[PDB]
């Protein structure tokens, strides 16, 4: 009812899930001003989401994303040029506007065999913090960071969401492929690969076998490799709608 209406509203807050939204209703929290008078019942995540509810409702226009990409790129370089960083999402596809900034990161020192190198990610975050681009953190794992950033005002921009994932170097291309989508494109491509005797996921590409239950990841040093394996002409992200 006009109250279910409430669970629907809450859930528009980053952090607030259903189960998580449901309880706050049982506590008598429904509107937003409810929320602000109630920071204490919210986690740090819910918290920040609440703090920029509006801003996070705004879309990101290309010109901005662009500048944003230059900042991330240029900062990561200075720390270590061996770092590879790719801004994925519809934006990579040429999209006129975006929701957030999804950056995939990698480094040769890190592979799926290592599996343990937080400093690699932390180091960049910190540097972004230091330059004043990242403004807050929602959460920060060993391999993933979710936070907020904003373009340097010279006078102001809305704050935007940003994610940074640390991926092992040997799985990185299958990754940039995946996070680049579209979703159809992925599916279509997984479909084909399959006719070709190959299974693809966000981590790897592996040849099939009898009965089907098969595998053993093929080496990939670029996106192109993937298409080679399935022997499909290479589609640039722009031609990736489906």
Curated annotation (Swiss-Prot):
Binding residues for a 2'-deoxyribonucleoside 5'-triphosphate: 59, 90, 93, 99-100
Binding-site list for Na(+) 2: 11, 13, 16
Cofactor(s) essential for the protein: Mg(2+)
Residue positions where Omega-N-methylarginine is found in the record: 62
One GO term describing the cellular component: nucleus
Residues given in the record as Mg(2+) 2 binding sites: 100, 102, 163
EC number(s) stated in the UniProt entry for this protein: 2.7.7.7, 4.2.99.-, 4.2.99.18
Gene Ontology MF terms: 5'-deoxyribose-5-phosphate lyase activity; class I DNA-(apurinic or apyrimidinic site) endonuclease activity; damaged DNA binding; DNA binding; DNA-directed DNA polymerase activity; enzyme binding; lyase activity; metal ion binding
Residues binding K(+) 2, per UniProt: 11, 13, 16
Gene Ontology BP term (one): response to gamma radiation
Protein name, UniProt field: DNA polymerase beta
Source organism of this protein record: Rattus norvegicus
Complete-protein stretch covered: 91 to 335 of 335
